[PDB]
Amino acid sequence: SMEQVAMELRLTELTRLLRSVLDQLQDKDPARIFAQPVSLKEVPDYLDHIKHPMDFATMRKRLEAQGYKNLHEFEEDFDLIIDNCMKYNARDTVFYRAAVRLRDQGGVVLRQARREVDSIG
């Protein structure tokens, strides 16, 4: 149907905007601490601690399959990145501190993304 196409075009355009958002958030992680999944070879107990692991590569795979229907879904995954790290790692660690800085800096980006998603529809 033509309606299904229109909906698909909207999803494609959201995907375009979320790609730009993802790029901007990942620049706030210049140490690449959150770039890839935590290695279960190197942290074999991780899944005993963290039930829903997340990282920027995993988000990018979902994004490119147009797997985010709305901004809320995308933000859920970004918050997992931050929140997983702040639980597994202690306050005094470069990991925790990296997450805090990512959260604070990403807030700005996400605030305007929300306005754009609402604005363009």
In angstroms, rounded to a whole number, what is the distance separating the alpha carbons of residues 106 and 71?
Answer: 14
Q: Where are the domains of the chain?
A: 1-121
**φ, ψ (nearest 5 deg) of residue 90:** -75, 160
Distances 95 to 19, 82, 91, 117 between C-alpha atoms, Å:
24, 10, 8, 31
Please name the fold of domain 1-121.
Answer: Histone Acetyltransferase; Chain A (1.20.920)
Distance (Å, rounded) from C-alpha 114 to C-alpha 77?
A: 15
What is residue 119's three-state secondary structure?
Answer: helix
**Token reading at 19:** 């790609």
Who's near 91: CB < 8 A, 6+ residues apart? none
3-state DSSP assignment of residue 40:
coil
